[PDB]
DNA sequence: AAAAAAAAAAGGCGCGTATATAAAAGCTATGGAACGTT
DNA sequence: GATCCTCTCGAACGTTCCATAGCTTTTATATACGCGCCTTTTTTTTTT
RNA sequence: GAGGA
């Protein structure tokens, strides 16, 4: 609107196009990478999803969950084949939600 | 407080309302001085009152070097007449006080750095540059040049009380930022 | 008069502290991996650290005969880097 | 308005714990607060897992003139059922 | 004496408010130690 | 017992891993695979020291 | 170690030089800064634990 | 102006002459500009630091510097021409300490190093020798 | 031996520093112009 | 593409030339305190 | 960086 030096228009047009481009994908081949004030390129959307800890493989096909624990294991020949010796402090942390029925209400009262 | 900032000078411009002949004044007048290569201003001074007449080609005459308003005026009226004494039809027109330069002393060092940290809205000490402090009071529009020796220099005024009234409102701050 | 020492100073320092051999403007194009943090976990670990050796990127992971006597035939961080990192 | 819910009682007025004090849990060891410009807490509790003794507390100024503090905590580790050898 | 800081280098004593943070006044050092408490810490002989 | 050989940056002791690289100013000859048109190559990556 | 102030220091209580050494360990100052102890080990199936 | 602002605020002692040696400011328009800028920032909203800088520039030890520190501390309470641009007072306190000591940094080197008067130092020293009474710590 | 000369500087104000007014007369730079120039 | 987990880090150009305001011109003055630089002061020096 | 396995 403010006067059109007819071929700075392209100089800005291609700029805008490039911006949108790298925004949706910062990894266009044969290109600069849109860097961000740090040297680290910009994490375009497309790279937010690219495999192996994109959204998909990293947050949908597998995620990180609650109610779990992790520790070193140790053999034991006094455990039934299907048993597992969870250490006490862990069990002090993981929980399981019971539902209060007439069958347990007393016992649950004791627990609480 | 109660210290009168004595006017170290008073400036006053008076317009002769004419056009002299600058070479004529140089040859004819006795207490006259005027150099073209430096600045086209007639350097006219009278022994009583001892001021200077900054006479330009346009009849603008400035009276500086007195200590009071009327001495800078009395010299001007003498200044105009001696120009008339040359043989011109000069006229004593458009007299006005230009500036009142003034200083005082307080006999005690002032914490100008103290003055600058709390009254930095108003103080300015440059010990590496200016051994005084610039304390510009808005009302009246007077600048207090505040020295470590105690020299509170005041100028930028045409009112005699304006220098005086500004100080009376600033001494407690100097006592605030004083040492002993 | 007006020589930017900070150029050399900060440039050297930054490069060391990160190990991106290149320029402070070079983020990834600068080669990295040099200048680690001197593992001081156990005296001998320290010693070993100071004599380590790297190879960027031909069967370079192999143990060539010419390594005889120059590079430890045994010590190497098996893993991805097996065979690349070497020790004198 | 940002109390860490740990235990500030250990440290002294300078937001430091004198060495030799026993600590544990997430007791704060550095009491650092930030102006809001009342002021919110930005302390540094020690790791929630561990405990031990404050060993030696060093106070100094940064390169640039910022006061800054290092704390060292001592702890004895006895071999246990799972440790590796 | 009761104590508040130790110069690291001079290994003497010192006391300070929230004033300076440095200057083992003798050596003028810049690192000070926090002058071990007196809480008579308790220990378990095992 | 400290043996030196490292730098102190920001108060954290850093150490420069030796980097290995091929020798300069050395002529080498390589066969090339069948798909290529060039059967052999002699290369020399001359560089000023 | 008690003067350095760095992250994550681990110090053995009562190190011991090994009984079976190699000549070179002399040059590594190993027998002055050993990194383990001599346990009386017994190789046996004791209780399946 | 803003550079001296930053240095003063972060407690860094800097000379107008040093700043001008950095930047051609003509120093008088600089004085006016710093005045107006200070006033502006005061609307928008402690001289001891200079000693060790010059102590270092002349290569002087820390006990000498603390002797100078105590001397300058008493300088404020020893009007009797105490400061009046106390940079001269700092440099003369330094001269007092070196003359108390046996250091071959005779006035020429210190003056040419700090760009100070070779005469204002002795002008201060005149009253300094009388003032010697209140300067003995140990 | 004795006269006379040759020459450093000491100390004092140079003015000069800043500080602040107040005055328009050689010079500067800013501010304005649009028509000569391809 | 190229496993698995912790966890650390940061018409445009010239061209001419009017039109804005300044600046800088000396000169009054308080202070410190800077070189500036005169002169005599004061020596050192040379010759008789 | 670390890195165990
Ligand atoms: Zn000390």
XYZ file of C-alpha atoms in Angstrom, chain H residues 3 11 27 29 37 44 48 61 81 85 87 100 112 116-117 119 123 128:
18
model
C 28.180 3.360 31.377
C 29.661 -0.547 42.615
C 33.920 15.876 28.621
C 28.904 18.099 27.055
C 20.793 11.543 32.580
C 12.521 7.168 36.565
C 36.124 4.281 48.379
C 50.206 -4.828 48.404
C 40.518 20.657 53.430
C 37.091 16.401 44.585
C 40.254 11.807 43.965
C 55.260 5.599 55.327
C 52.325 9.845 35.166
C 47.278 13.494 38.283
C 48.989 16.726 39.291
C 51.654 19.472 42.764
C 49.394 20.485 48.363
C 48.446 15.586 55.514
